[PDB]
């Protein structure tokens, strides 16, 4: 079985990680590192083989831990991921994988010679809505896709009202997710279009973005996040030469988790029928078709399943290096020049 | 009683002009000019008092001939004591446009572009909403005009005959006559089917500072339509599905005079979802205003006979051709700043 | 101002005729004949200009009564038609005659007298029909390949007795849907039947499936079933450029029963929920799914027609060609056991 | 032509009164009294023949004024209503008509003897949703009405928290509208049931009520107001022996008005067709019928049309004296005993 | 033996192994139920006193005595149970439970209160709300026959008050052409509205037996709808699949107390509170108000 | 476990794909004297044998049929039974389940549809009524039985003298029940897939079984979600119980497994002979016509 450890015990760890791990028989969470142990938030876990320590080395030196998940503040990712790759352990890093496009390459390179797996945490590649469009595009019955719009909107006027560094903005904390899974399906684009700003406060950190990733001359996928959307856009708009696929309703795992409903419970991550995506396409006979597509089951744990299969079964790494590095690049160059801006992408020669 | 003429008589004059004029009792069409007359399609009209010739001289004409001679025929009729109502393209270049404008102002005549789509039902609905302002500070608008005609546009040709110039000029216009002159523009013009053919797709966004941004876009490969209009404010939204039906009813052989003409289907009434001062959410349907292209002339009437200000403003028409042209000044996607 | 009389003062008269003639000034109802007079219903009218008599002759032997409407039961339509015919115009209520002969007779035997003789086809003014009619004329659906017309109910145990074919659904309801469709596509080339009583073998027809083949293309259908829980559309229309489906019947009948009179604002008005849905393609190949606002229906518009035909001699609404055609199909429907076929 | 005046120029006068009067040609608003005239909010009316004064007698002594409308603070209504009746002028009073059922009987009686019309301003008798039920009930196709539920809810958790006098709670502020129009339709009920309280803060003034009006043994009409309703109830529910009428959505005049859309604009008072009430009933033959019922046009101005018709043409008054007294009484006795209570009504003999 | 026995029992046991019937001469008419471990059907008993006694005497011989409240396993009710337990709707401030029909002129006769709508229907909707929120501090009654002035009650509107914040109503009308939601739930963070009753009965009456596929199955069309705001203040509206319903589950818990000894499905304090509320809805001419006192046994 | 063979190839859509999950069965040879590997490639890769020799596949367990039949080998056309796979469609299975428990009472009418909107897409065998019609006709005859009489309306709404691409066929089962089979290549707004009326209620079903659409799409049977109907199309049923109450609810559409045929005799002989009778006697007299049955 796989023996893992954690560095950090905050919100994300307690919501998007551990909860799904209580079901994986093959994964063994041995030790969790924490700056300071919170008896109330640690007890529940200590009642299990889990050990909390305040000494980082006491985990980095443990020849038992095989991989460790870093989920602490962004200002500490590069350093930590490097220290863990230094020991003979694999890493799993929460957004952002790294600060600069250079550091990311380095880390990935270091992991190779050390013969360990370095991989960013892209759980939202297991969202039902995404999984649904993934499936469709995979079956290719919609023909050749020419446009795909992806939204992550809210109605929170007044939410973001202060200035801050680019890493604490929408594009960085939310775009990474949408952009990531689109890149994992269609590849690295040739050119990118940027619209990033704060529609409510001049210089405040970005709380709005509209990013276009151009693939050739036909295909383009848009990444849109707005915090002032009263009536939601479709979660995913997909147009192909043969038809379309519209999917309303986002994955509910995040809401269930926020409402004490955990993964083991029945129907968890199950989408509402009213929100099943609608497909409208004409077949070879020119016959128009309009049907619903049962939304795939959204399970964030599936990320931990691929990491288990990638480490102990040499299976192919879920998040390829090319995507991981491409993500940082697009994300980093959005702030290279005032918005709106354009930026071409040269091939990746790793 | 206004007296006008028609420099042309193509598919256009026989669908967006004449059919609406047989109701404007205050307007009289004395003569239609055409190189090669077609009695078959000109018989009904002739039998009502309109004469046709192939030459010239008598207070306003409408250019609807091929979109090339417009400028040439434009400054030609201004040179005569006659007001001008030009069809799109109003002018090839921005200088030529500002030219005709200057000439008109001194020649003592009225000159403006034919923006019939400013009276489209769908547009009139989001115009009404924006005026009343219960949606607060508008932050985004998206105007669509799509089709699903895969295989349609598949040949090279000048920018003057692509979607961005054909369809595009309409959506861009009504959006500008509502917000003004953008401080910068985003261009993504191309052909999603034939790498070099004239553009059959575009995604143009007009930026207005940090707050406002309106997007205009056409695509010919949309099987399930987007809403004709998406409007987001700081207090709520307004989504409108379904396009104005005037055009379609015209092709069906249905004319302006008939009943129900230009009436929207209830099922397509746009939905506004916003919250009042108290914070209560309200979600209601907005009755679509009646679409009527004939209003272009009615309004033009009050301008040439009652002096009332024209529908299309100068700042408008010019700013309209500028955005339209600079979308080629570079390969797309490109950005372009607009100065006063 | 045309002057008329009525032979009968039952439900029909007091529902599809009188209330509508209340706003029609040019028409005057001088006298009404009935076997037995019920003052309760007479008074409101008597308070106006109207004489209620119990002697048939009182009416027929009048000089200013130019036209009379026969609303008395069907088992007396034929003979009575003659009475008014053998004197000064006749408007007979469904069903005109029982045989194409009597129908042919009364029809012509009326021109040798100098009076108009047309049947009562009020449902040729139903909004749902005015809708398909408005669609067909504009013809954007192209060449109509088929049309389905329903008039169903859900009344098990409804009709159990046997009776002449004049008192059957086909005659009572069929004449309505068949009429307006014939008034639209003319006389057919051949007709298919299927008449019976899906509940009581002997009982009079309470169900009927009739097809009117118009050549090789068009084929209008007419159906009525007293055992339908979930309604069929009120009107199905398929063409070469698209379709038009209309749910919900005209509401004048429901409003009349609930006491809402013709003159009331909103009378007969159809609800959006039931507006017909049209889906077709244009010359560009684009698809279009839009709603067709149901046109307002007015059963009075019939008396407005019979008015012109009598005063300004305007073209008679129900062509003698349609009247005779309708009865022909209606009659031959029992020539041989069902199902059957019959050409014209 | 009817010549009237106003005592007060606050929010309600500039919202539910004047905007509608600027279209009834037969009515002339001559003078408006107010302690302080806001030249801005007064200019437009001044552009017309309306005089603004801070001297009450300047209005009461004006012999040209036939009727006045008191829309000034509630605590002053009984006083002013009287001071105006003592002068030969009819009175239109905003809510509350009076503070006590005893005072109400007084003003009405002083009115009959003084020869002038005296009636409370019940604009809500012209909300579109209410007109629809009034239309259906009169047409009588639903048969005998057995039950009818009337709602006025919101989702404002926390909105009401401080304790204050009853005249300030929901039952007195909203209940006077829903109870008034139901009573104007069915009459004085035999017994009333009361559920009045604050479902958030015990002692706080009432922000909730569920009042039952019983008519004999067959009919009961419920008046309901709750400030914690996320998913709306139907605005009206009507059940009768032959079927029912359910109506969703509330009349939009107030929202429009609040938004700045005036009574003369387009579509004002017209209901969204998606909200037309739905009627399901069986006819005498047993057939079932389900249809929408186009919502009548909502127009608070009709109150003035009715006032006019009565004061100038002697037409029967809108708000009957018995309806006025019954409103105050049912409202007053809701506090006569602790909630949940029951109260028995006796016939009136004004 | 008869209606209930052949309807809401046997068919469910014909799939149970640990259980095995045999004999049958506990579904005696509502008139005669007191006299007769016991599994009494609804209503359990007539008066409050008779109820306690009928239960205490059972705690003497050392056997288990519990009323048959099978609708605690209706899909619709389970849905609101699951939602309330999860608590995303915050503090419940009101819930309305409906059981209506459109059967005009159905009831026009007179009879004992025990065989009235409130007793033979109120008990089903009252019990489950009681087994989730407990005994109420005060009850409100509106019980009558809206068709015949003196016939047995065929209508009722009863409100159970839980303090100052919570109230839940139980309503039954036989004259409702257009249905209310089956359950309406309002709370400080949102609502849950549920249209469409448990289908077991419809299938039972349609000959479809419990031991077959699709039984009790609810359709999406009727999946309750939840609308509420999360902590971020975001509005969420979603359908909530309806928990499969099975009346058989009643025995699984009864049997679970006889041979195993698990906690009795229907707690004593509940069953006693039930018959108490029923009986007092009559201790006075409607409408009336009955304050509940604390229980002690 | 039995062995089988295919007297043809191509079948590569409504046959093989399904069989490759039925362990106790295995193909052998595909009688084809022109088996172009360009297509039979996939299958070739599988443990199957592509031959072209007559007796090779005519000697070894299960017109052109006469031959296959003459030998001791059982055959299935399209133990001897014809291939009626569409008896396992979601729609039909639904309209079938409802009748089995028949809470609708006594069925009195039902319309089976299969339409398209292919304007210009155009002997009796080549006939739409023959090829398509037998599909909608077989299952109905499989549920009720043999009708007394039958009504025909065969023709081509396209070009006067061309193969039949439309038809309205009624099957009068006495004086009460009447099932109608309809097909039209000109329908922009589809009818329901099935209409079923009865003494106590109705059941209307929209949307056809998706197996075919999945197949021509690239979705093989063994995959998940294959053949699942969208809730959007679950059938609706309005019916009154014995108490008089009206009940309206959806009916989950049963999973459509064409492969269920092989698992099976299913197709009765009479149903089979009767099936072909009506097909034939429908072209006798010109249309519109009628034809009684013995």
From TrEMBL, chain F:
Gfo/Idh/MocA-like oxidoreductase C-terminal domain location is 96-285
The answer to whether UniProt assigns keyword Methyltransferase to this entry is no
What top-tier enzyme class does this entry carry? Answer: oxidoreductase
Q: Per UniProt, which keywords does this protein have? A: Oxidoreductase
Which ranges of the sequence are coiled-coil?
A: none
Q: Matching InterPro entries, A to Z?
A: Gfo/Idh/MocA-like_OxRdtase_C, Gfo/Idh/MocA-like_OxRdtase_N, Gfo/Idh/MocA_oxidoreduct, HMG_CoA_Rdtase_N, NAD(P)-bd_dom_sf
Alphabetical list of Pfam families matching this protein: GFO_IDH_MocA, GFO_IDH_MocA_C
Q: Where are the transmembrane segments?
A: none
The entry's protein name is: Oxidoreductase
**EC number, as in UniProt:** 1.1.1.-
In which organism is this protein found?
A: Bacillus cereus (strain ATCC 14579 / DSM 31 / CCUG 7414 / JCM 2152 / NBRC 15305 / NCIMB 9373 / NCTC 2599 / NRRL B-3711)
List, in alphabetical order, the GO biological process terms annotated in this UniProt record: antibiotic biosynthetic process
Is Oxidoreductase a UniProt keyword of this protein? yes
The Gfo/Idh/MocA-like oxidoreductase N-terminal domain extends over 3-82
- Cite the GO molecular-function annotations of the record: hydroxymethylglutaryl-CoA reductase (NADPH) activity; nucleotide binding; scyllo-inositol dehydrogenase (NADP+) activity
Give a Gene Ontology cellular component term annotated to this protein.
Answer: cytosol
Q: Which family does it belong to?
A: Belongs to the Gfo/Idh/MocA family.
């Amino acid at each position: 079985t796989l023996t893992m450890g954690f560095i950090g015990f905050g919100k994300s760890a307690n919501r998007y990680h551990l909860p799904y791990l209580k079901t994986r028989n093959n994964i063994k969470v041995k030790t969790i590192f924490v700056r300071q142990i919170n008896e109330e938030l640690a007890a529940p876990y200590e009642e299990r083989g889990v050990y909390f320590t305040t000494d980082l080395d006491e985990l980095l030196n443990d020849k038992e831990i095989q991989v460790v998940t870093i989920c602490t503040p962004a200002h500490t990712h590069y350093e930590l991921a490097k220290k863990v790759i230094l020991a003979g352990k694999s890493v799993i890093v929460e957004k952002p994988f790294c600060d600069t496009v250079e550091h990311a390459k380095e880390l990935l390179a270091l992991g190779r010679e050390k013969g360990v797996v370095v991989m960013p945490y892209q759980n939202r590649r297991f969202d039902g809505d995404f999984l649904a469009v993934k499936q469709v595009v995979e079956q290719g019955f919609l023909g050749d896709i020419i446009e795909i719009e992806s939204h992550i909107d809210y109605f929170r006027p007044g939410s973001i009202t202060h200035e801050a560094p680019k890493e604490e903005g929408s594009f960085y904390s939310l775009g990474i997710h949408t952009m990531d899974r689109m890149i994992s399906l269609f590849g690295r684009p040739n050119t990118v279009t940027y619209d990033i700003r704060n529609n409510e406060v001049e210089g405040a950190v970005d709380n709005y973005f509209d990013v276009g990733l151009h693939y050739g001359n036909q295909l383009k996928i848009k990444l849109k996040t707005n915090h002032i959307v009263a009536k939601d856009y479709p979660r995913f708009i997909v147009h192909g030469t043969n038809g379309s696929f519209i999917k309303y309703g986002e994955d509910q795992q995040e809401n269930d988790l926020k409402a004490g409903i955990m993964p083991e419970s029945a129907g968890f991550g199950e989408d509402s029928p009213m929100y099943y995506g609608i497909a409208k396409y004409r077949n070879a006979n020119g016959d128009w078709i309009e049907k619903q597509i049962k939304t795939p089951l959204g399970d964030y744990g599936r990320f931990y399943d691929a990491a288990y299969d990638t480490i102990v079964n040499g299976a192919p790494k879920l998040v390829k290096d090319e995507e991981a590095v491409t993500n940082i690049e697009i994300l980093e160059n959005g702030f290279a020049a005032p918005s709106p801006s354009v930026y071409k992408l040269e091939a990746l020669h790793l």
